[PDB]
Amino acid sequence: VKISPQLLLAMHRFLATEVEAFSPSQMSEKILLRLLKHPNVIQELKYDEKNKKAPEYYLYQRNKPVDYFVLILQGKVEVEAGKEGMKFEASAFSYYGVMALTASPNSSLLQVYIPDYSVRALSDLQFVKISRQQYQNALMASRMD
Amino acid sequence: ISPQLLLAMHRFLATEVEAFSPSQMSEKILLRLLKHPNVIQELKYDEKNKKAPEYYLYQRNKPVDYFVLILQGKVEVEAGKEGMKFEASAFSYYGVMALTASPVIDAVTPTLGSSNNQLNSSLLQVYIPDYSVRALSDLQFVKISRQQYQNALMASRM
Description:
The structure is a homodimer. Chain A is an alpha+beta fold.
């Protein structure tokens, strides 16, 4: 996935200033930029009007454990929030699932992040995808530089 | 719910499954737990509406908080990464770790089932089965939740 340097700067500046998880206090800007340039962190998704309700077009499903964070860069998504599944539209720079990253910790149970919402693609999507593991590694890397 | 069958399953759990061993749970309490309402359940099978959500006792990558012991009937089990399919019948049990798994250390998030402020928290300690269980016929089975199991332990602790 090839993106322009301008777009990379915009998403970098937004996360570093708006999302505390990526604040310079938690994560150095040098590491953050490397994390964004990491392969498959930035992804795209081709939309199919025929298969609109396909599983490949659901970034999040309510009551389905997930372990990654998303930042929409381009495109439209439908969001189903709450018990009644209140639908509304979200576009660029709407993010989801930060708690999957920043949540603090064989025969044990597992702490998971379960979204109280669903996110479905309405059109072609370009977005960021950062897993808890990628984020925790980014903290350790920035925790020593 | 014949007395003969109830004793058989009691002896099986108390001897085969350590979670219900006399060391963990007295045999007197175990019997009371089995006679507890809704611990023993049934399920009518519909050949027309097979693969229905009401016929899945367990679903892959779907958090669960209960234990099952088949008493009568057949189920299809899809186990592991490669989804090895096999058939299981009476006295096949599932989800023991759902009961005996210990919580995360120095963790404040609530466990699924206990409902300790779960209604508003998105972080939940869960047991996630690496398998699926689908009903192939009418089922009679035991169903013990983590909370019902923990309550049985406290009862036997006195």
